[PDB]
Structure 1
Amino acid sequence: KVFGRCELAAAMKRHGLDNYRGYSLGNWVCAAKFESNFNTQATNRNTDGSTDYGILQINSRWWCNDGRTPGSRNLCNIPCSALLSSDITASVNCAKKIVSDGNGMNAWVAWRNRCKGTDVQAWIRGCRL
């Protein structure tokens, strides 16, 4: 499923991401935009052999089991395939663990390089939340 901007904003807010560990909703919508273009089905392979999954491109090196990432963890205790559902529950609940692990949203390279230090407020501009 490809979300609209305000659609993903509303769903993320319902799933408790608004100001989770201090990251306003706009940070999360900005991250999703530049990770997946709001597409729950987004997959991209890392050079190390790991693969990134879903709306927030959660990586199989640490967070999920794709069955082909040797010497890797499943710290969200899920199949990576569950990160590609039209229901963002699994991506959201795993992202809450990732952002809690001490590095915050810097774990999302696209957030660091494209959202960090910008008018992230702009991503929820006009939305009924």
Structure 2
Amino acid sequence: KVFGRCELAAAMKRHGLDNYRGYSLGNWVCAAKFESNFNTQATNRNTDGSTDYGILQINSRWWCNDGRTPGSRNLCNIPCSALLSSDITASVNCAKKIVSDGNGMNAWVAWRNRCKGTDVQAWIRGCRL
């Protein structure tokens, strides 16, 4: 599913991401925009053989099982295919663990490089939230 910007912000707020671990909602919508263009079905292969999955491009080396990343963990305890559902529950729950891992949303390189330090509130401007 390809989410609308305000549509995603609302689903994200309902699932408890607004200021989760101190990160305002616009950070999460920004991250989704540049990770996946709001597409739940986005997948991307990494150089190390792992793959990023879903709206927030969660990686198979640490967070989900896809059966093809040797020596990897499944810390969110889910198949990576769950991260591609039009229901973003799996992705949000896993992102809560990821953002809690020590480095905040720096875990998302696209957030560090494209969202961090910017006016992220722009990503939720105009939405009925």
Same fold (TM > 0.5):
yes
> Per-residue deviation at 1:110?
0.2
> Per-residue deviation at 1:26?
0.0
List per-residue Cα deviations over 1:15-66 (Å, max 9, x = no partner).
0000000000000000000000000000000000000000000000000000
Residue 23 (1) aligns with residue 18 (2):
no
Structure 1 stretches of 4+ moved >4 Å: none
Write the distance in 2 (CA, Å) between the matches of 1:70 and 1:35.
24
Write the distance in 2 (CA, Å) between the matches of 1:123 and 1:52.
23
- Percent pairwise identity: 100
Write the distance in 2 (CA, Å) between the matches of 1:4 and 1:116.
22
The corresponding residue for 2:70 is 70
Alignment partner of 1:44: what SS? Answer: strand
Q: How many residues align?
A: 129
The corresponding residue for 1:107 is 107
Gaps of 5+ in 1: none
> Per-residue deviation at 1:113?
0.1
List per-residue Cα deviations over 1:62-109 (Å, max 9, x = no partner).
000000000100000000000000000000000000000111100000
Write the distance in 1 (CA, Å) between the matches of 2:42 and 2:109.
16
> Per-residue deviation at 1:115?
0.1
Write the distance in 1 (CA, Å) between the matches of 2:121 and 2:82.
29
